[PDB]
Structure 1
Amino acid sequence: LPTWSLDSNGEMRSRLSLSEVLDSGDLMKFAVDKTGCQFLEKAVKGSLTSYQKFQLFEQVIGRKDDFLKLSTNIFGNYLVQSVIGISLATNDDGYTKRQEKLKNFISSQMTDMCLDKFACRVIQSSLQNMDLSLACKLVQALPRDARLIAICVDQNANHVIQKVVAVIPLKNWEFIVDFVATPEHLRQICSDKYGCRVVQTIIEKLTADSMNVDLTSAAQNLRERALQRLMTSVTNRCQELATNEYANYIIQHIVSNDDLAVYRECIIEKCLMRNLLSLSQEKFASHVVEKAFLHAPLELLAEMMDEIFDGYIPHPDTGKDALDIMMFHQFGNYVVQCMLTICCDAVSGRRQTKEGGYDHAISFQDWLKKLHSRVTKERHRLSRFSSGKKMIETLANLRS
């Protein structure tokens, strides 16, 4: 802090004016100091004369290097965002030159700003507050090489991509969809803790749900094609995705979203069906198998049930079948609990049995009798386990 702005206690003076700081030439010293930036943030929200704004514009967002210095500063980035807001609210003759400049500054340093913990915040507010036509040019400045992968999996930069998805029309970021759908890119991004959230955010935006009814038909068509291309890529790798520590959340999202019903069915047929016993025994994929049972169309649900009850040959020596392996497995037990719950819900009316013009009620009764007969026969062993006790309880509590 400048000596002129300090007392004899070494602390920043009180009754300090915004014009004193703007005139001094010392703004950069205040903006990167906690207390100094704290004063500027208050001063900047008040009534500003034309000249005060003019000076903030020139000092905070008028020169590339000071702008970068502040944007990437722990305290400075807040002043930059405030001044960007004030710039956008000030429709004088210099409006367009200021906004074009800001667009140039950021564009030329897009990647580095995105990856910066503080500058990514400047990017994000610019994206949502700038005129749409200028915000779209910020998106064009995104990298198209390995740097985009790095952006998607970065703890800071992933929020930039998510913001783009939120406030920019699809045409401008359609390249990100195609980038992510590329087989090797999808693999890397989906199997990352930040990247899998980015991919789901993209999927949600590409879904024709209640939040997209404002779209024109041409825009819905554009959305559908992009969805279709991303989903094709996801389903081509559903096996790797469903079994992965992070990507399983994506597969669960698709499987349980009614507005993605056609893709849910594709996934079930592509990697789930015929692998139910195997997958039910995996730490990550068992959650996906539960989702499938819960949201499958009744025709596929019947196939899934039939696979568990009669899809596998028992062990040649002991007589242990798929249901046996599953009821006692550390992960598979949750899938059996899920099958039971579905049947009880159906038979007690808590779940719609009509679908495909016909009533599948007797199928549910059939599956329930199977489960009830097994649990009755194995009650002694099942009562050793929390999961077993839960099933026994469920069956008795349905009779009541």
Structure 2
Amino acid sequence: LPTWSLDSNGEMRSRLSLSEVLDSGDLMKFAVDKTGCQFLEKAVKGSLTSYQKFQLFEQVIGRKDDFLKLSTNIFGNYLVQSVIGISLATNDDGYTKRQEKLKNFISSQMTDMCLDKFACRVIQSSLQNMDLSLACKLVQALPRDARLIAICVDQNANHVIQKVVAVIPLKNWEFIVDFVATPEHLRQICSDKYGCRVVQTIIEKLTADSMNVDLTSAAQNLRERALQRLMTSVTNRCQELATNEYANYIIQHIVSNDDLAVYRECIIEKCLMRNLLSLSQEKFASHVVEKAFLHAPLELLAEMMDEIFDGYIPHPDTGKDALDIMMFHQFGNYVVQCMLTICCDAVSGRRQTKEGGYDHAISFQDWLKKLHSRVTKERHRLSRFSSGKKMIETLANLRS
């Protein structure tokens, strides 16, 4: 940093004024230095004369190249965000030009910035602080090709998409919904550590839940359709997503949320029914099977219960059935525990048994009797395992 600003022992002077720095032409040097940038940070949080503001506007966010340089800088990016805030607060004659220029700078370099660890932070705060019409233009600058995928699955850039989803009306980012819905994109993005969070965030935004009551009816309609398009695509690839190490959380999210009930039933019918035994044996899909049991509508839950109890032919030699296999399987045991607990909740009053214009209590009692009889019969083998001991305990707790 500038020698004129240092003391005898090579350290930044203590009585340095913001104006000295602004007048010196050496701001860029301070802004990329930790000590210098922090001094600037504190200095710009206080009172500022009009000229001080004017200079900061020109030197921090007035020229494209210096703007990118600081936005991509580990320290500088904070000063950029602070100066943008001040610019937005300053309604002088230059307000409109400064804001348009900031739109242009970011837009023209949108992809480059999104992917940069530090510039993406500048993007995200700009999206929620800038006038909405200008923030909307930033969204428009997002790429529509393979770069969008990279953005969705980047550990830093994914948060730009999530911010867009949070603070920008849907119409501006509808293209992302459809982009992600493409069979090949859906596969990649959902099967990615970060991308699956992005898809979930999208689904949540598209959900007609309590958080969306402020939407106009026209906007709800826009949302309903976008949700329906994305769900169609998720449903077509339900099997692949359910068994995937990352996308299974998405299927779980849809199956678990009452506000997505219609989609819950689709998914269960499309990839779960008739596959319950095999999926209960999958590391990742076993968690989806549990969610389905927990949240299926009663009529469908009866089919699921019937599939486990009666749906499969016992082994030709040993007589082992689906229930034997699942009870002792490293992943299947959790599903059977889930079925048991559902039944105990139902007959214990902890779970509503009325639905579809009828009291299914009789059904839960039947299922429970089956499980109890199985566990009674196999108590010795079962008690060798934590899972078996848990079920035995669950049943004993029910008696009393």
Normalised by the size of structure 2, how large is the TM-score? 1.00
Query: For residues 220 and 388 of structure 1, what CA distance do their matches in structure 2 show?
Result: 48
Query: For residues 91 and 350 of structure 2, what CA distance do their matches in structure 1 show?
Result: 59
Query: For residues 311 and 57 of structure 2, what CA distance do their matches in structure 1 show?
Result: 71
Cα displacement (A) at 1:16: 0.5
Cα displacement (A) at 1:282: 0.1
Question: After superposition, what is the alpha-carbon deviation per residue over 1:290-344, rounded to whole angstroms, capped at 9, x for unaligned?
Answer: 0000000000000000000000000000000000000000000000000000000
Name the structure 2 match of 1:81: 81
Equivalent residues in 2 for 1:87-98, closer than 5 Å: 87-98=87-98
Query: For residues 162 and 147 of structure 1, what CA distance do their matches in structure 2 show?
Result: 16
Query: For residues 215 and 14 of structure 1, what CA distance do their matches in structure 2 show?
Result: 52
Name the structure 1 match of 2:33: 33
Structure 1: where are the runs of 5+ without partners?
A: none
- Runs of 4+ off more than 6 Å: none
Cα displacement (A) at 1:61: 0.2
Question: After superposition, what is the alpha-carbon deviation per residue over 1:104-151, rounded to whole angstroms, capped at 9, x for unaligned?
Answer: 000000001000000000000000000000000000000000000000
Query: For residues 208 and 271 of structure 2, what CA distance do their matches in structure 1 show?
Result: 25
> Are 1:62 and 2:62 counterparts?
yes
Query: For residues 20 and 293 of structure 1, what CA distance do their matches in structure 2 show?
Result: 69
Query: For residues 130 and 360 of structure 1, what CA distance do their matches in structure 2 show?
Result: 55
Cα displacement (A) at 1:242: 0.2
Question: After superposition, what is the alpha-carbon deviation per residue over 1:1-44, rounded to whole angstroms, capped at 9, x for unaligned?
Answer: 10000001100000100000000000000000000001000000
Query: For residues 139 and 106 of structure 2, what CA distance do their matches in structure 1 show?
Result: 10
Question: After superposition, what is the alpha-carbon deviation per residue over 1:226-282, rounded to whole angstroms, capped at 9, x for unaligned?
Answer: 000000000000000000000000000000000000000000000000000000000
Query: For residues 357 and 47 of structure 2, what CA distance do their matches in structure 1 show?
Result: 66
Query: For residues 161 and 337 of structure 2, what CA distance do their matches in structure 1 show?
Result: 39
Query: Percent of pairs identical after alignment?
Result: 100
> Are 1:395 and 2:398 counterparts?
no
Cα displacement (A) at 1:101: 0.2
Name the structure 1 match of 2:165: 165
Query: For residues 254 and 112 of structure 2, what CA distance do their matches in structure 1 show?
Result: 33
Normalised by the size of structure 1, how large is the TM-score? 1.00
Question: After superposition, what is the alpha-carbon deviation per residue over 1:185-217, rounded to whole angstroms, capped at 9, x for unaligned?
Answer: 000000000000000000000000000000000
Cα displacement (A) at 1:60: 0.2
Question: After superposition, what is the alpha-carbon deviation per residue over 1:339-365, rounded to whole angstroms, capped at 9, x for unaligned?
Answer: 000000000000000000100000000
SS of alignment partner, residue 194 of structure 1 = helix
Equivalent residues in 2 for 1:1-400, closer than 5 Å: 1-400=1-400
Structure 2: where are the runs of 5+ without partners?
A: none
Question: After superposition, what is the alpha-carbon deviation per residue over 1:44-99, rounded to whole angstroms, capped at 9, x for unaligned?
Answer: 00000000000000000000000000000000000000000000000000000000
Aligned residue-pair number: 400
Query: For residues 132 and 152 of structure 1, what CA distance do their matches in structure 2 show?
Result: 23
Cα displacement (A) at 1:392: 0.2
Question: After superposition, what is the alpha-carbon deviation per residue over 1:149-176, rounded to whole angstroms, capped at 9, x for unaligned?
Answer: 0000000000000000000000000000
